[PDB]
Design a protein around this ligand. Structure first.
Ligand SMILES: O=C(O)CNC(=O)C(=O)O
Ligand SMILES: [Mg+2]
Ligand code: NI
Ligand SMILES: [Zn+2]
Length: 331
């Protein structure tokens, strides 16, 4: 069995290997990459996402979110307070202000220590989940707006045509902005490209050990667990590496830099934080190996997680027993 320790693998495709997205994902899996839950892909040196980032300041962040923490430094929840709209140029200036800028630090490890010691004491502002793309339309390889759609994959594998669309989303971050512990909707894959700016640190639990993370989460967040059997779908819970190590949870960590892709694999729980002003683009995708994970994915029926239009069909076809309950939570 390849990659039995479930380490995060890093890939360097050539330009020829970069031409066929599906084939390369299947290659990475042949080497055991999925066992980690996360892989890094460094594009060939001939590739670029677009020519420059000089013309992005007029993008609007309609609903910036202030991420307010509650709990203790290693075990906390965050909620999202809506703020007034601002442009990417206004957000960048805010990110670089003395109130929000990255502190002086020695290296990534020192910054990670500072994040876990100090995150809860501040409320950074995140531009999340903005529908759109920064890939040039003439970028032909690994263009996140031109991938095969999940609805087309379900049709090819299972024969059923379904409604829905699959589009990318932008993320504008600053120091301490945080993505809470989660798997993707319907335990899909994700691909994430860091277009510009400062790094993003990731934590991940191997898919084969996901239930260990869920059990610890129910212990650490006992009221949230009573409220919802799939409360990590709310995307609010943070647990530090130190706490994970104290509780014997298997995980890995890696830092993504500008110009790099990360792939998350079905049922790979992940969390992380931004080092400073940055912009990432992400989208969900599927392969034939996802289908069996999609059939088994948990679902939030409490009302909180409130998702996309296109998840309806996935629940309806893959999880018909759960459909009625899950839809009552959506309405
Ligand atoms: O960058 C983000 O805020 C978080 N990314 C992801 O959850 C992803 O691409 O799977
Ligand atoms: Mg612009
Ligand atoms: Ni994700
Ligand atoms: Zn819920």
């Amino acid at each position: 069995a390849q990659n039995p320790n479930c380490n995060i693998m890093i890939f360097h495709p050539t330009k020829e290997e970069f031409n066929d997205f599906d084939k390369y994902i299947a290659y990475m899996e042949s080497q055991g990459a999925h066992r980690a839950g996360l892989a890094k892909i460094i594009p060939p040196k001939e590739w670029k996402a677009r020519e420059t980032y000089d013309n992005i300041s007029e993008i609007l962040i309609a609903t910036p979110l202030q991420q307010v923490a509650s709990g203790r430094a290693g075990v906390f929840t965050q909620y999202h307070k809506k703020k007034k709209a601002m442009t990417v140029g206004e957000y960048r200036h805010l990110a670089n202000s003395k109130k929000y800028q990255t502190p002086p630090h020695q290296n990534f490890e020192d910054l990670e220590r500072k994040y876990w010691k100090n995150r809860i004491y501040n409320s950074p502002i995140y531009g999340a989940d903005i529908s759109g793309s920064l890939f040039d339309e003439n970028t032909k390889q690994w263009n996140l707006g031109h991938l095969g759609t999940i609805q087309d994959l379900l049709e090819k594998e299972c024969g059923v045509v379904i409604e829905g669309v699959n589009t990318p989303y932008l993320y504008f971050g600053m120091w301490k902005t945080t993505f809470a512990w989660h798997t993707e909707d319907m335990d899909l894959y994700s691909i994430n490209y860091l277009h510009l700016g400062e790094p993003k640190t990731w934590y991940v639990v191997p898919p084969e050990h996901g239930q260990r993370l869920e059990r610890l989460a129910r212990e650490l967040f006992p009221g949230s667990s009573r409220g919802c059997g799939a409360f990590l779908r709310h995307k609010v819970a943070l647990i530090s590496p130190t706490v994970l190590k104290e509780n014997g949870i298997p995980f890995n960590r890696i830092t993504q830099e500008a110009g790099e892709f990360m792939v998350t694999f079905p049922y790979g729980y992940h969390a992380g934080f931004n080092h400073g002003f940055n912009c990432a683009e992400a989208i969900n995708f599927a392969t034939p190996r996802w289908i069996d994970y999609g059939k088994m994915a948990s679902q939030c029926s409490c009302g909180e997680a409130r998702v996309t239009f296109s998840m309806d069909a996935f629940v309806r076809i893959l999880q018909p027993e759960r459909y009625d309950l899950w839809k009552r939570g959506q309405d």
